[PDB]
Design a protein around this ligand. Structure first.
Ligand SMILES: [Ca+2]
Ligand code: NA
Length: 159
């Protein structure tokens, strides 16, 4: 089809949406940036939703999290590590690559269910209990979440 697909990327932890418009057959990266400021990520649990009528999921990863679990059936993932994952400056938390099959307008959403941040205890090289920050708990976001993170949702041609 010569008509296009507009993809809007949202997340509970993103104040703004991302958007792009693409040709049928194009490959598209939808990714979510997380910046943990002067802290690090300890734990995350998330689920991603998309419309299989319009997109085909080609890959789903946590590019910064080598020991993360991605469930391709449920389109979800999780990670937890006492050594932490350094998201200072902003890094990709989740990246989904799709092929555009259909046309119109569609939403891709990252639902962050759990998110805990922390800092290392220089004496141990593992997370300091007193540093831990409960950013999201069972889908409930902290009142001061955006004092502790920056985030962004991006939709771009795949390279
Ligand atoms: Ca077109
Ligand atoms: Na910074």
């Amino acid at each position: 089809a010569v008509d296009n697909l507009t993809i809007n990327a949202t997340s509970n932890i993103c104040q703004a949406n991302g958007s792009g418009t693409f040709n049928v057959g194009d490959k598209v990266s939808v990714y979510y940036l997380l910046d943990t400021k002067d802290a690090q990520l300890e734990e995350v649990q998330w689920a991603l939703t998309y419309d299989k009528n319009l997109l085909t999921l080609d890959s789903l990863t946590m590019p910064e999290i080598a020991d993360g679990m991605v469930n391709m059936d449920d389109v979800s993932g999780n990670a937890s590590n006492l050594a932490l994952y350094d998201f200072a400056g902003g890094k990709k938390l989740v990246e989904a690559v799709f092929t555009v099959n259909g046309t119109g307008t569609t939403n891709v959403d990252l639902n962050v269910v759990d998110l805990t941040l922390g800092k290392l205890n220089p004496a141990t090289g593992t997370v300091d209990a007193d540093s831990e920050y409960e950013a999201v708990v069972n889908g409930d976001m902290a009142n001061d979440l955006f004092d502790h993170i920056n985030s962004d949702a991006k939709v771009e041609a795949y390279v």
